[PDB]
Amino acid sequence: TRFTEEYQLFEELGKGAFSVVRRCVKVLAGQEYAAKIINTKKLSARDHQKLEREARICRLLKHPNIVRLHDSISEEGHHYLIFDLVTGGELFEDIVAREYYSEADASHCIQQILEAVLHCHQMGVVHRDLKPENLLLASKLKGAAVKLADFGLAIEVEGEQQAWFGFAGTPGYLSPEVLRKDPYGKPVDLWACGVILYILLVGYPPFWDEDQHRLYKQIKAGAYDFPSPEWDTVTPEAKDLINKMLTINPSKRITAAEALKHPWISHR
C-alpha cells in the first residue's frame, strides 16, 4: 500500500526480533530515513500492544533529542515505522568504548536527555525505560545529538496524574516507587536520569548486584555512594544534581525543568 508508493528501500542498517531496519528515501521529498520493517504475523498479543502504543506515542513527540517517528504504515502482514536516520549507535556502546565522560561531556549529554524528557513530560508522556541502550547518537561525529528512542514501554498521563501503570522498565534504572508498587508518573524518568548521569561520569552504575533481591533493596533504600578515588575530584554540583535525581521520594525529586536550571547544566 502507501509504504511502497512513497518510500524507496536501500541497504540494511540493523536487525531486531521479527524486524529489519533499512535506509529508505521519501521519493517525492528526497530525504533519507530509517525504515523499521516488522513481521506482525510473528508478534504476540503483548508485542502488538507495545508496537501500537510505540507508534502512537513516538508520533505525537517532535524534538531534536527524540528519534522522530515520521510515519506508521500497516500493510498485508508487515508494519513500517519511518524514523530519523541515526548512524552513531547507542550511548551505551559509546560509554563502553570511552569508559566514561568528562564533566563537560556528561553535562552536555544529560542536558540533551533532560530536554527530551522535558518535551515528553510537557506532551503528557512518561518514557518509563530511560537507559543508555535507549539513547542513540545522531552520527559518529563528536558533539553529535543524543536522541531518546524505544517508546515500547511509554505511557500517556493527564497532567500530574499519579497511578499504578504497572511494573515495567529495566532493573538497574527502576525507580523506588515502581519497586514499591506505588502510584507513579513523570518523576520515574528523572530517577533513570540520575542513574544515567552517575554512569556517564565514572562508567559504572550506582546500583549493581548479581542478587536482584539485594539490587532492589539498595534502590528502595537509595543506598548509593561516590567511591574513592574516582569521585574525589568530581565537583560538588555534579554530585548535588545526582543526589536530587536519586531522591527516593518522587515528590521531593528534581523535575526535568528544575534540572535544566541547575548550575551544573544552566540550559534554562
Binding site: E133, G152, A168, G172
Partner: peptide, 13 residues
C-alpha cells in the same frame, strides 16, 4: 557496566 533488557511485567530474577 553490562547491557540490561526492558521488561513489561514483574519477574523475580
Amino acid at each position: 557496566l553490562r547491557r540490561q533488557h526492558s521488561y513489561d511485567t514483574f519477574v523475580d530474577l
